[PDB]
Amino acid sequence: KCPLMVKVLDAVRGSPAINVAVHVFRKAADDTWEPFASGKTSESGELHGLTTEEEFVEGIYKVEIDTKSYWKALGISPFHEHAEVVFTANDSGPRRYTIAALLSPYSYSTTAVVTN
Amino acid sequence: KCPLMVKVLDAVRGSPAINVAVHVFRKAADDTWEPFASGKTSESGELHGLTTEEEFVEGIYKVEIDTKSYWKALGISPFHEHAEVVFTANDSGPRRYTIAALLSPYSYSTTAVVTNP
Amino acid sequence: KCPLMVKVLDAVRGSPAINVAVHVFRKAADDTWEPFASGKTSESGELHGLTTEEEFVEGIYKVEIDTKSYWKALGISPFHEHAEVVFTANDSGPRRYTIAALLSPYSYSTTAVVTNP
Amino acid sequence: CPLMVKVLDAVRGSPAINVAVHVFRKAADDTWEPFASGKTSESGELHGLTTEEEFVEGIYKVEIDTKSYWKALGISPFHEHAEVVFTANDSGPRRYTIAALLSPYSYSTTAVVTNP
Numbered sequence: 001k002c003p004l005m006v007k008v009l010d011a012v013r014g015s016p017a018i019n020v021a022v023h024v025f026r027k028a029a030d031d032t033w034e035p036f037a038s039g040k041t042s043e044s045g046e047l048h049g050l051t052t053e054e055e056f057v058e059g060i061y062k063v064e065i066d067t068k069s070y071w072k073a074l075g076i077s078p079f080h081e082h083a084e085v086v087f088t089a090n091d092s093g094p095r096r097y098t099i100a101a102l103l104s105p106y107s108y109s110t111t112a113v114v115t116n
Numbered sequence: 117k118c119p120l121m122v123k124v125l126d127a128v129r130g131s132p133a134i135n136v137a138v139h140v141f142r143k144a145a146d147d148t149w150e151p152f153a154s155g156k157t158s159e160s161g162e163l164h165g166l167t168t169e170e171e172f173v174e175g176i177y178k179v180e181i182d183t184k185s186y187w188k189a190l191g192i193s194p195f196h197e198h199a200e201v202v203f204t205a206n207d208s209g210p211r212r213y214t215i216a217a218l219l220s221p222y223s224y225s226t227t228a229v230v231t232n233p
Numbered sequence: 234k235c236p237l238m239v240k241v242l243d244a245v246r247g248s249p250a251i252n253v254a255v256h257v258f259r260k261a262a263d264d265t266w267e268p269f270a271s272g273k274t275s276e277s278g279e280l281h282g283l284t285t286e287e288e289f290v291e292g293i294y295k296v297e298i299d300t301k302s303y304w305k306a307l308g309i310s311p312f313h314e315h316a317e318v319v320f321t322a323n324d325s326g327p328r329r330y331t332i333a334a335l336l337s338p339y340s341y342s343t344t345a346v347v348t349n350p
Numbered sequence: 351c352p353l354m355v356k357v358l359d360a361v362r363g364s365p366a367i368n369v370a371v372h373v374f375r376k377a378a379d380d381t382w383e384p385f386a387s388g389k390t391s392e393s394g395e396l397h398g399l400t401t402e403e404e405f406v407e408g409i410y411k412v413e414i415d416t417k418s419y420w421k422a423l424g425i426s427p428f429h430e431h432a433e434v435v436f437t438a439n440d441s442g443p444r445r446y447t448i449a450a451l452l453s454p455y456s457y458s459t460t461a462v463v464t465n466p
Contacts, residue, residue: 012128014195014222014347060430079130079461081409084433088417102344102458104220106130109342109458111335112428114247130463176314195320195345197293202314216340216358216451218460225335225342225458227451228312229363245361247428247455312363337453339363 003056004089006063006099008045012076016045017103021066024050027059036061058090063099071105079106087112119169120205120213122179123162127220128192132161136186136219140166143176152177169210178202179215187221195222203228236289237322237330239272239296240279244337249278253303257283260293269294291323296332304338312339320345352405354447355412357394361425365394366452368422370415373399376408385410407439412448420454428455436461 004024010017024037037050063085071078085099096115101108120140126133136157141149153166179201187194201215212231218224237257241250253274258266272280298316305311318332328349335342353373359366369390374382386399412434420427434448445464450457 009344009346011220011223011344012192014345016346076128079436079463081435081437084435086430086433087428088430102223102342104127104460106463107125107127107218107220107458107460109225109335110429111242111244111456112247113242113249114428114455125460125462127460130461132462178314195347197319197321200317200319202317203312204314218342218458220344222347223342223344225340225451227337227340227358227360229339229358229365230312231364244453244456245425309361335456337360337456340360340451340453342458 001096002048002050003053003094004051004061004063004097004099006039006047006050006065006101008041008047008065008101008103010045011102011104016043017041017070018043018045020070022047023064023066025062025064027062033062053094056090056094059088060086061089062086065101065103067103067108070103076105080108083108083110085110118164118166118212119172119210120167120177120179120215121163122166122181122215122217124157124181124217124219125161127218127223132159133157133186133219134159134161135189136161137182138163139180139182141178141180142173143178149178172206172210174206176202177205181217181219183219183224186219192221196224199224199226201226201228234329235281235283236286236327237283237294237296238279238281238332239274239283239298240331240333241274241298242278242333242335244335244340249276250274250303250334250336251276251278252306253278254299255280256297256299258295258297260295266295286327289323289327292321293319294322295319298334300336300341303336309338313341316341316343318343318345351397352402352445353396353400353412355388355390355396355414356447356449357390357414358449358451359394360451360453360456362423365392366390366419367392367394369419371396371399372413372415374411374413376410382411402443405438408437409435410438411435414450416452416457419452425454429457432457432459434459434461 020041025033026036065083098113100111140153181199216227256271257269259269270283301311357366371388373385388399414432
């Protein structure tokens with residue numbers, strides 16, 4: 001039950017996307033994106049350990065998912081350069097955020113599940 | 117200008133899903149689905165010339181989209197046999213309805229928007 | 234685990250859809266949807282224990298999700314009567330199937346992930 | 351109309367009206383230069399924000415101001431905005447259109463690309 005989990009699924013093959021480059025940033029006071037965390041999509045597609053409740057701080061985030069590498073490798077030219085999910089986090093306090101991403105070569109979907 | 121519209125798009129190819137079969141029914145009191153309308157999806161991925169406002173009634177409807185025939189032709193083995201949307205129609209009055217379909221080999225999404233003519 | 238899992242989520246509340254009734258129909262040789270199993274979605278929005286691996290057989294199935302009962306409980310006017318997904322199962326070997334549903338008052342999405350264990 | 355942005359409201363079941371749309375373009379200094387801006391009509395679509403001559407090969411970014419739209423309608427949303435980053439005109443001239451299905455706490459985007 002990580003405070004930020006990014007479950008990633010592939011709709012073309014019908015299986016979880018495996019080995020997708022993911023990067024988490026953070027908006028700073030200078031309106032500049034600074035690195036915050038990184039990881040690799042497992043066999044099941046889920047992610048863990050990107051941030052902890054102490055490190056996870058109020059502000060604006062951005063989750064970057066590298067669709068270019070994933071579909072370039074598998075031989076289908078993808079449209080989107082990557083995926084980005086920007087959201088005001090911990091606005092009302094500590095909560096559990098789940099970012100779900102359903103990928104296609106030329107489309108993707110995003111969902112937030114807030115446990116509160 | 118048409119009351120019910122169904123739009124279908126292909127997610128893997130990033131294009132409208134062509135030549136996709138669609139069928140429409142009307143719910144009956146005895147829980148029997150009666151053939152209502154059926155057509156071939158246009159090159160734009162949208163249905164044209166389907167139904168008229170007089171044909172609509174306060175009864176339930178259901179629209180079926182044949183995804184499996186679509187994926188067989190292109191050569192990808194699909195998961196879904198077909199897609200079905202069941203919705204109570206004209207509870208208030210004669211309005212325009214639009215059903216969106218986003219097709220994938222192993223998924224699809226559907227959305228509904230209503231309009232008042 | 235279970236050969237068939239159905240997961241239901243709510244878009245607007247960012248929460249799993251709670252207290253949603255589901256019904257599973259297995260097709261029969263008479264082209265009739267014989268009842269197969271039914272369940273109640275937990276607070277996690279998921280459900281298990283529909284059918285054992287032995288109960289599953291090659292054929293065509295159907296999962297029906299009660300959307301209006303969920304919206305009537307919260308009080309928004311539904312568009313969709315129910316959500317129905319139809320797929321051939323165990324076509325070659327005893328693969329595992331998962332059906333996910335993302336619910337909004339006037340839209341829903343369904344995705345299926347298939348694994349060979 | 352090299353680029354179009356269709357924006358639909360799931361809860362209301364109607365095209366979203368008056369959402370702020372902004373378009374950026376990658377620079378050699380890895381900087382986003384504001385390409386254009388617009389406002390969505392009652393149909394939920396945008397037209398004339400860019401021209402074919404102005405639209406050239408590169409990396410673009412389309413941002414949709416969902417934060418104001420759902421706050422205006424009175425429901426607190428999750429996403430600060432929607433970002434659709436994608437390389438363009440890599441293989442030559444083609445018409446690009448972006449569709450966004452919005453809900454408070456969820457959204458999906460699908461691009462349909464036409465060669466002519």
